[PDB]
Amino acid sequence: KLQDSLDAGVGNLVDADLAKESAKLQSLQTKQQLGVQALSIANSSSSAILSLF
Amino acid sequence: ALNSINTNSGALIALQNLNSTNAELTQVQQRINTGKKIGSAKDNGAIWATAKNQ
Amino acid sequence: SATANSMNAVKDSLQRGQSTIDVALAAGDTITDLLGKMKEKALAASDTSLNTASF
C-alpha cells in the first residue's frame, strides 16, 4: 500500500490533465491561424503607398 | 491527476481490494481442505501449541 | 493572474496532506487488528481453568 501511495503521489506531482489540454489545444490552433492572418494584413501596408505614385 | 494517462489510482485501489478477496478465499480453501480453523502455528500460535500438547 | 497561478502550489499541498493521511489509515488498519487479537489473548488468559503452560 505504501508503494502504491508513493506512485500515486508522483502522479499528482507531474501528470497532465488531458481534458484541460484539449481545450487549450483547440484555442491555440485558432489563435495561430488568426496570427498568420494578422501578419498577412501587416505585410500589405507598403502596397497602399503605390497608389499615390 | 484527474484525467491522467500515466497513473490510474483507481485501478491501484481496485487491485488492492481484489487482493484482499483472494487472500480470504485462500484461507477458506485451507479450512475446507484440512478441516481445521487452526491448522498451523501461523493461524494462532498459542491455541495451536495448547492443542499440540494436549 | 499571478494569484491564480499560485493556486497550483495550494493544490499540491492539499494532495500531499491526503497522501499522508492515507498512509496513517493503512497503518491504523494493522493496529486495530492487532488490538483485537490482543483483547482475545487477555480474555482467554483471564480464565482460571487454564494450566500454566497455556497461560
From Swiss-Prot, chain B:
It is found in: Secreted; Bacterial flagellum. Belongs to the bacterial flagellin family. Flagellin is the subunit protein which polymerizes to form the filaments of bacterial flagella. In C.crescentus, the flagellar filament is composed of multiple flagellins of 29 kDa; 27 kDa and 25 kDa. This is Flagellin FljN. The chain holds residues 2 to 55 of 273 of the full protein.
